Amino acid sequence: PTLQRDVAIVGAGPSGLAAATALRKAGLSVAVIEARDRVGGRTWTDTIDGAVLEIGGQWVSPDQTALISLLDELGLKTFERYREGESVYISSAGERTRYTGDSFPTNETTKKEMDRLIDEMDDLAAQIGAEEPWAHPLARDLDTVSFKQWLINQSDDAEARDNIGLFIAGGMLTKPAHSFSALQAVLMAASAGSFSHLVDEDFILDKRVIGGMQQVSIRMAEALGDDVFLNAPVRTVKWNESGATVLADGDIRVEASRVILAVPPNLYSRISYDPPLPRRQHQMHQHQSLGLVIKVHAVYETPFWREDGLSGTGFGASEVVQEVYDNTNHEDDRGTLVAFVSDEKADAMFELSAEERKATILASLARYLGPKAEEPVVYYESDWGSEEWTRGCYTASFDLGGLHRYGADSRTPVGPIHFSCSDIAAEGYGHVDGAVRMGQRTAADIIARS
Ligand SMILES: Cc1cc2nc3c(=O)[nH]c(=O)nc-3n(C[C@H](O)[C@H](O)[C@H](O)COP(=O)(O)OP(=O)(O)OC[C@H]3O[C@@H](n4cnc5c(N)ncnc54)[C@H](O)[C@@H]3O)c2cc1C
């Protein structure tokens, strides 16, 4: 059918829904048009082989105040990731060492170099900020050198560089360090409130939502009722000065004063725009791309590692699995691990059979926490790259040199067309907290003009 609303919202991930929520609060009418048969986009709770698993985004850090606010406003509660006992570090040389502490048990040299790099990243993020990295006088220099090359420029120590890289590269951008810029690294750190925050997993991986993160979008959408349309990919946006018409599958047609495109940048061109967007959007959008990470879930009879006095945390820059954490659900007696294979290493695992990939990842888990890890009861791999309405994970980021060249244009509305996703956020960049922020900023920006 066909309908009028003040704002048409394309995509019902946490960013779009957040916008829809805030717009309704201000007495403005919305239609949220979603491609999938569900809401929540890159967040998604589902039962696989009888195990409740968080396929997408799931964690909540203390600096994520927009989201903490929304959580409390929607009546959802949180809980700590388990953290008692020792973490496991696996060196460049493949040596596994248990440790407690805020810093990795490397030799002194690497330890000092790490600390110098953490401080140096903290200072650059404090000076540069997550709001407009591109506008800082240091932006050009920082954004035309890869994070790889920058680290080489700063430190002679292979292992320290690799370990710093782990936190940004496989940690947040899920692209290799040779493919994004020092500026982009800085911007990541600023968005979490600092690099030290990215380093301490007790911070960035603090808490989860009882009921899973998808509940955040499900609740916002339940409150929107018939104004949320599922199974409706948006194909065309006709627009002008006064407003737009959004066409979607199942003969849907929304006429509105403003549009929010609440989809990750790499999918903007999935929609035909009549007339075509300006040259600048045409170019900038090509330079944006998602990372790749396999998010691995293994479920065990008990959380077995806790008996050996381990926390379930592992870090290993040179391992096929780079991070692992305890991801035992609230009140579950079965133990659950979450592990990550990133960028080029995810490619390599995807090049193997489903069966040979699982053996290889499980062997890696085994090198962290012992051979009981090769005996899971449920095993599952997240696969956002295969999904036509995502195409990777966790976030889209500019190619090398893209951020300073295009950054300032990335949120600018084009006539009635607005843009909101976590991939272009300031604080919370790439995280649910970002999606929520961008949605709310988009709504406010729309309110102020109307
Ligand atoms: C494996 C993985 C792990 C993650 N880990 C963390 C974490 O633990 N902590 C954290 O906070 N976040 C993390 N993230 C990232 C986080 O999930 C996202 O950044 C956040 O969900 C962004 O949401 P969004 O609203 O901006 O976009 P999305 O969630 O992608 O929403 C976009 C929506 O748009 C829809 N859509 C796209 N095109 C169209 C179209 N043409 N027509 C109609 N609908 C369309 C899609 O179907 C989707 O529902 C994780 C993400 C992944 C993938």
**Which spans in 155-296 are helix H?**
158-165, 182-191, 195-199, 201-204, 214-222, 279-284
Residue 146: how many CB atoms within 10 A of its CB?
Answer: 19
Residue type, 97: T
For the domain with range 107-199, which CATH number is right: 1.10.405.10, 3.40.50.720, 3.30.70.1280, 3.40.50.300? 1.10.405.10
Residue 42 CA to ligand 1 centre (angstroms): 3
Q: What's the reported resolution, in angstroms, to a tenth?
A: 2.8
Calpha distance 90→317 (Å, rounded): 8
Distance of CA 83 to the CA centre of its chain: 22
Calpha distance 195→197 (Å, rounded): 5
Task: Please work out whether the CB of residue 267 comes within 6 Å of at least one atom of ligand 1.
Answer: yes
Method: X-ray
Chain region(s) in the chain for CATH 1.10.405.10 = 107-199
Q: Give the neighbor-by-neighbor strand order of the sheet with 310-315.
A: 96-99, 86-90, 310-315, 323-326, 335-342, 293-300, 378-381
Task: Please work out whether the CB of residue 228 comes within 6 Å of at least one atom of ligand 1.
Answer: no
**Which spans in 108-181 are helix H?**
108-128, 139-143, 147-154, 158-165
Measured from the Cα of 267, ligand 1's closest atom is 38
Residue 355: how many CB atoms within 10 A of its CB?
Answer: 8
Cα separations in angstroms, 162 against 92, 151, 175, 176: 8, 9, 14, 11
Calpha distance 131→108 (Å, rounded): 36
How is domain 42-61+78-106+200-209+291-395 classified at the architecture level of CATH? Alpha-Beta Complex (3.90)
Let me know if 92 is exposed, middle or buried by CB neighbors in 10 A (0-12, 13-18, 19+).
middle
Alpha carbon nearest to ligand 1 atom 13, residue: 57
Q: Is the dihedral of CA 301, 361, 179, 158 positive or negative?
A: positive
For residue 411, what are its two tokens? 């949120």
Q: Are 261 and 417 in contact (CB under 8 A)?
A: yes
Residue type, 250: G
DSSP letters for 302-330:
S-GGGGGTEEEEEE-TTSSS-EEEE-PPT
CATH topology of domain 1-41+62-77+210-290+396-450: FAD/NAD(P)-binding domain (3.50.50)
Chain region(s) in the chain for CATH 3.90.660.10 = 42-61+78-106+200-209+291-395
Chain region(s) in the chain for CATH 3.50.50.60 = 1-41+62-77+210-290+396-450
Alpha carbon nearest to ligand 1 atom 17, residue: 57
Pocket test for ligand 1, best of 394, 436, 438 (most atoms within 8 A of CB): 394
90 pairs with which residues across the strands?
A: 96
Measured from the Cα of 42, ligand 1's closest atom is 29
For residue 363, what are its two tokens? 């062997």
Alpha carbon nearest to ligand 1 atom 36, residue: 11
The packing angle between helices 147-154 and 182-191, to 10°, is 90
Cα separations in angstroms, 146 against 93, 135, 186, 187, 394: 25, 19, 12, 13, 20
Count of residues for the chain?
Answer: 450
